[model samples]
Target chain A: KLDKGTVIAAALELLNEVGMDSLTTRKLAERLKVQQPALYWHFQNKRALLDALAEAMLAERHTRSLPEENEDWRVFLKENALSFRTALLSYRDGARIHAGTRNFGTAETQIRFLCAEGFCPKRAVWALRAVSHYVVGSVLEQQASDADPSSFLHDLFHELETDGMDAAFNFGLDSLIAGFERLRSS
Target chain B: KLDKGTVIAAALELLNEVGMDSLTTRKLAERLKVQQPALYWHFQNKRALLDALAEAMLAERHTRSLPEENEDWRVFLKENALSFRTALLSYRDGARIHAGTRPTEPNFGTAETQIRFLCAEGFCPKRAVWALRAVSHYVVGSVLEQQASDADERAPSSFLHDLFHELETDGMDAAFNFGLDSLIAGFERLRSS
Candidate 1:
């Protein structure tokens, strides 16, 4: 008797629990205390469910704001980048799932509007497309590191604990932000 | 009868054939006509096997001349970034495998030497560290894209073509290269000042 909303909530809960690899419709059914057929009644297939899940995840956090109209384009744009990345990292395999799936028409329109808002008209369009790739790519790296932050650093430090290794990891986020800052300032 | 070299080779072959997720010690043993226990004799476990595989792969293509002596630091550094990325992409899941593994002592030494050479003097150690991270992170991004490119573009070319037509900008290698070049150019501009 799960509604579409309940089914997606169950899917998101399952995603955070078992991750994207083990997520499936049958599992969602079991989690909801419902039959598999009932789950499919809401989402025709796993692909549809994942698409919906992605849209739901995006919709939960994506807010419309005017970055171009802001006084400091750099701060506004960087915050936009940070916000997009934060949303992706909120779920397990969130960035990977978002990267792989295609959104439906509604989500696509929202994305286009967000892009226009962020970049404006001229280079905004290309910036929008490129920023998606960059943000996703960057978030994937961040997500992978965050997944096992201690272990990744432990391995790096064990191998090369130069006087600078600690400094390197500590400042990496700033460097990444700085790289983007340089791009914006130019 | 498998030695370290054979074990590493078998792992590489399995990696290429089935990728990292599906690769396993038992399958590698079967490929080498040996028992899975034999692999354990050389590599204490699967993680060790991957560590050795990464080392072997890097050794196969690693050049000691990174950050070339006479070239401008920026050009030397950019080429170094490209070479590391190329080496990682040379094998399946190579970047993922190397991302968290501890390299053997000699490999670690080589990497340290390269970092030290790049940091020579007169620059903030902080900037040097940042530069190193920027390059490494960018390379990781490139490898991830290269690895995912096939699966991401699996639809009919016509589908991609039609999709690109609707995109506000042209989709071409040149467009892709623009992002790559912009990243490098940003680094160069940073280093210049």
Candidate 2:
């Protein structure tokens, strides 16, 4: 008798091991040493299972509020951006899974509450959208970086002993925060 | 007998129709009425074929130079960013293919030229790298917007409209270009600071 939490836990572990492509209810059943029908008892369909998986992943690290009250929107925005990045990196294909579903409702209360805390709705929306896109873009880039055969870019930087690669990767995050700072100041 | 170009053309057409995942050499061979070995003659493997496809896609609109000789580095950089967006949109799974492979010697030339242009006005290599990454990141984001599943957060436009209309704001291109401008503006500020 597989517990519901035990089943979900096994499924996520499989997700990290096999990624989104090979994850199936049957596989989850096998991992849990239970019959495939048992999963159906917990999750009505694959979509339901995926939704649960996404929710679990989001809940693992995401909090409804920042720990401190900060008036500086730049610092506030950076923390939010970094939190999103941390959530995506917690599991394999976490970004891909999150990208493929609609989970806004689960996080909406927290998101709306946070937006109301420090900034106007419009600017908060922009900051939220910007950070989400930037993180998604960064994760996709990171995932595909392995496929790029030409280490020429990285190799060149390494041979030159240039710290450019680190700076290049971090620049978007830095600039996002910086841009928000400028906008808030102006 | 079909030439290599004919095979690649057939493959590209199939790509547009069925997409990258379902596109196989066997399917490409079938489209051209040739045997599988025929494709191997032109392309050593699947990766080689994809690389050639990427090259063909880039050749479609490879610009001669950056925006202008005396343009602000920002303008030149934006033009380069747009060029990449244009290239990725030219093919199905274009960005995926482009990002998946190493830049060949031929492709490296364009990146090299862009980096040199950025550094031409006394910009440090670090800044040049930052500028290029920003542009590349934006380009990837735009193309991903095109191919992102309806449920993905990375999808910058339509999905949000369908799922949460209140959260939805604008068209894909509009959202993309706005981000593009923000990124370029960020780079410009970096140059000053």
Candidate 3:
């Protein structure tokens, strides 16, 4: 007797434990103290389960927030982008799972917020896409490096012993934001 | 007797035939008409095989080329970014394979050359590193979205009908170029400030 939320909660915890490649229904079922068939009734397959997990990951974190009235688009975008990164980094393979999952329909609202801030529909849409692409790509590499100490990126980050990926992530984010500002002015 | 190159070639072909999720050493060995043990001889495990596959994918497609003497850093980045996207989209789940595997030594060389090129163009080393990193992230992220949609099952939506058009082949090109232009401009602004 398990609800979808409980299943997702268990699946996410299992994901952090085993990582994405090793995550399996059998392992998840055992973790939940149930059989595989019971879990299958809810998810049907690993892909379906992952999709649900992705949705839940965003929902559980405040990553999918909408803007307040009169909120500067830049401020909103920066906060949302940081929230999105935090959510993705919360789990072991969170960014990969989020990237693989289908869109869950926040685009229209995000576009509208930018439109209110003077971005044309096309610019608004592409702006959000660019921001998301940067965050997902940044987190994906960061998580990969974290998981495998032998990874080249990981080694370079540690050897330098600088601000590491955080510095690079912020640099990229700032550039994107600055570029977006130029788009509105031009 | 299978060398690493032969195994990598066979593995990449298998990757295109079956997506990354289903690609296994067993099937890869069968495709090459050899035992799994032979693959083990070249690559002790699947991860090693994938690292080789990733390196080969980039090398085969010329995705890791460096800038020519005194070439504009922006031009070099745009070309390299386009080449990287083309390479990633060549194999099924190519970006995923690339993102997951460890980078090879030539990748280090490529990064070094890129940093040097940006420095020559008057960017501080920090700005150069950030610019290159941003471009690379954008390319990988774009390809991940593109390839994931290759299997999109979501029904057509009225809300995003126009967005769908923008996501088509030509539209993706525009979107990529637009992002590239923004990043380069942003880098330019940083250079002066």
Candidate 1 at A180: error in angstroms?
A: 9.0
lDDT of 1 by residue, A116-152 (tens): 4443232333344444555665556555665552453
Order of the predicted models by lDDT, top scorer first: 3, 2, 1
Candidate 3 docking band:
acceptable
User: What value does the TM-score of chain B take for model 3?
Assistant: 0.85
Model 1's DockQ score: 0.18
* Candidate 3: Cα lDDT at B52: 78
The better candidate by DockQ, 2 or 3, is: 3
TM-score of chain B of each: 0.73, 0.77, 0.85
List where candidate 1 sits over 4 angstroms from the true fold: A14-31, A34-55, A64-79, A99-134, A149-186, B40-66, B92-123, B152-177, B188-193
TM-score of chain A of each: 0.68, 0.77, 0.86
RMSD of each: 6.9, 5.6, 3.8
List ranges where model 2 is wrong by over 4 Å: A18-29, A35-54, A64-70, A102-126, A146-156, A159-167, A180-186, B21-24, B40-55, B64-68, B92-106, B149-170
Query: Candidates' TM-scores?
Result: 0.65, 0.73, 0.86
Interface RMSD of 3: 4.4
Candidate 3 on B1-193: residue-level lDDT in tens?
Answer: 5787787878877887877878888888889899767777787777887787787777633644778776687788778878888888888888888888754344666666666677878987666767777888888998889788885642546866866676664557767777777777677677533
Candidate with best TM-score: 3
Candidate 2, residues B29-142: lDDT per residue as tens digits?
A: 788887777777887677788888877877634673444677877677667767777888887778667655554554566666666677776565667766666666666655
* Candidate 1 pairs with clashing backbones: none
